[PDB]
């Protein structure tokens, strides 16, 4: 069950109670389709049925050759603001799968696979480098061509096919056509992976025989729609009468640990005169999951997809942070973990729809309200950073933008605090910090207070030094703070 805590002090909330499906790795499978290799159609009848069959044949031919052009080029793909994204690492998503694709070209590797599938589809092949992979043959097109159309390639008259065969071949061959089309516009790498690349029945019957937990098996096969989006299909080869491509599939190595989504919104002062305001916003936005005694961190909402209570994320775009980061939802000033924040001068009305509610930052004359579908507006917001639960609320309107709130259920707790923007002195408070921490702001402050300390102590230190005596052509002596004339004493 999902709960949410809002922190009035840090203009942030946390959505707690989720579960983590974490993509930790890959498993590469080899999908294949058997293809009769036919360069020459010699049948001279003319009967519309023969004609249509020949048309589909040419479609198949051009499909093959298209795919060969695809095979020559080695496949590749490519897969900030108030977010910490810029801190992320950089990785090669399909690197694994591509290594397998290479291994397939190796002379005689194909034949290992063709010889593994004699007595049944879906079987294990170990490759020359001893990386073992599932291989599944999802289409036998060569068989149908043989058992069905063989008159039309090698005979001239060439007995006439019945129209049922025409329909059937169009049906069968279509899959190859679509797989080819996809690989064409996508330069040989597709994600998510199609129903044409793997049928639900095929992908489940793959998952089932992968080397993983029954909890993992159960987890993918419940979530197939997600599994697809985290998978790739890589065009590999077409040779020796088999088209073969690798589908690299996500290995979830961290299942059912706690996860929470941290939400952030502009904090800011209420000073009635404009431009005189100082403003502070936490930059630790996004997903957090317990992983292996640490906490992982997904700064980018694109990395994470939310099915009900499970949060599927990709560790590839993530950082792994020591657990003490959970502090800043309580003591943002706690020194054991230094929390990251941006600072600036620009007070602009913003709002952020959270899991169980909505944060609202209302600054200036902007009108901020929350309304119910029946009762109309049920709350008007003052200037500041506030929050409202999803219970009894439907819409949150801020300025001219009308936000709808998620209606999924859970308990929501408002946690009062004094807005930490108030603890800062406007004069020494830097707004030039784009990417910053709490202590780095403390540091630019300690320097801009320091040069006040030094300049004031220097100005007071020349107090204790004596001015010039008069220029009047008399000699002067020092007596209790002043100059006196020497004449006084003689």
């Amino acid at each position: 069950n999902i709960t949410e805590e809002f922190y009035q002090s840090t203009c942030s909330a946390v959505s707690k109670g989720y579960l983590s499906a974490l993509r930790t790795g890959w498993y590469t499978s080899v999908i294949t389709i058997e293809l009769s290799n036919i360069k020459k159609i010699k049948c001279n009848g003319t009967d519309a049925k023969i004609k249509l069959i020949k048309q589909e044949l040419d479609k198949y031919k051009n499909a093959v050759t298209e795919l060969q052009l695809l095979m020559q080029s080695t496949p590749a793909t490519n897969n900030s603001g108030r977010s910490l994204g810029f801190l992320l690492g950089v990785g090669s998503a399909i690197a694994s799968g591509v290594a397998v694709s290479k291994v397939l070209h190796l002379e005689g590797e194909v034949n290992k696979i063709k010889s593994a599938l004699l007595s049944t589809n879906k079987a294990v092949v170990s490759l020359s480098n001893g990386v073992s992979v599932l291989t599944s043959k999802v289409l036998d097109l060569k068989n149908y061509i043989d058992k069905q159309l063989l008159p039309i390639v090698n005979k001239q008259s060439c007995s006439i096919p019945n129209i049922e065969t025409v329909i059937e071949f169009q049906q069968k061959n279509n899959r190859l056509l679509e797989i080819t089309r996809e690989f064409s516009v996508n330069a040989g790498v597709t994600t998510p992976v199609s129903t044409y690349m793997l049928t639900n029945s095929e992908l489940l019957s793959l998952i089932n025989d992968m080397p993983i937990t029954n909890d993992q098996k159960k987890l993918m096969s419940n979530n197939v729609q997600i599994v697809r989006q985290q998978s790739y299909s890589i065009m590999s080869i077409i040779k020796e009468e088999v088209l073969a491509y690798v589908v690299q599939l996500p290995l979830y190595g961290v299942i059912d640990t706690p996860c929470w989504k941290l939400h952030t919104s502009p904090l800011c002062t209420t000073n009635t005169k404009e431009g005189s305001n100082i403003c502070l916003t936490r930059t630790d936005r996004g997903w957090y999951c317990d992983n292996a005694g640490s906490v992982s961190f997904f700064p980018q909402a694109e990395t994470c997809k939310v099915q009900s209570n499970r949060v599927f994320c990709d560790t590839m775009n993530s950082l792994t942070l020591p657990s003490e980061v959970n502090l800043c939802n309580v003591d943002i000033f706690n020194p054991k973990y230094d929390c990251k924040i941006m600072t600036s001068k620009t007070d602009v009305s913003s709002s952020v729809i959270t899991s169980l509610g909505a944060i609202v930052s209302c600054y200036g004359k902007t009108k901020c309200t929350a309304s119910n579908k029946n009762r109309g507006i049920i709350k008007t917001f003052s200037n500041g950073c506030d929050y409202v639960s999803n219970k009894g609320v439907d819409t949150v309107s801020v300025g001219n933008t009308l936000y709808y709130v998620n209606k999924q259920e859970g308990k929501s707790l408002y946690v009062k605090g004094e807005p930490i923007i108030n603890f800062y002195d406007p004069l020494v408070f830097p707004s030039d910090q784009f990417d910053a921490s709490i202590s780095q702001v403390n540091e630019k402050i300690n320097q801009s207070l320091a040069f006040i300390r030094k300049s004031d102590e220097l100005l007071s230190a020349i107090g204790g030094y004596i001015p010039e005596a008069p220029r009047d052509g008399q000699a002067y002596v020092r007596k209790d703070g002043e100059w006196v004339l020497l004449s006084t004493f003689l």
Partner: antibody
Amino acid sequence: VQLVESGGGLVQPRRSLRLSCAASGFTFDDYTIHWVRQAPGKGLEWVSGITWNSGYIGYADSVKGRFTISRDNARNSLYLQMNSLRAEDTALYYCVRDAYVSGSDYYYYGLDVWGRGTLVTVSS
Amino acid sequence: EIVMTSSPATLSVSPGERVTLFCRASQSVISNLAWYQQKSGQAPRLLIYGASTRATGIPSRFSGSGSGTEFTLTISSLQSEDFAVYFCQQYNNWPLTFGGGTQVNVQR
């Protein structure tokens, strides 16, 4: 649906014998077929097999270049040939259909159809 | 070739009792595996295939697990005509191999 082995007998060592299998009651071409032998009071040994068009055929390491397996598909027949027949080849020889059709819409697996099997004894 | 290792040698279980037979495989056979029953003096009957799915005709006493190196055949309540020899086979690669077999003898 029947597989009927024929041509086992009593054969002297080092000499040759031919076994045939006639097929009945199912469309023969569509299936790939294996010869599987069983020594007396012993286990099952896969001898060899062919598949739908003598496209791929394969042998046990035990019988290699000694044995040869071809099919007609016309006579709806299967043939295994036994040369330099050694004395441990004696066994009941089974014609066995492989239920995995490759490319029909519903797949089956395993070895579903077995003859009574002939009986080949290599002794002097 | 990968070696099916049948086990136990023999198994003795009294009529109407669960019996369990085991098949280890040299390298991983995944699931492509089958179980055969052979009553003395006749051919194999095919019991299970895909390790998990009983062939048409087989009663629901016979049940199997699998997809790995280690595998299981389970007969729910042994009945008169179930005392026979059982063989496992994988079809993952050629050559098709088998185990040695497990005799189930009626226990006295």
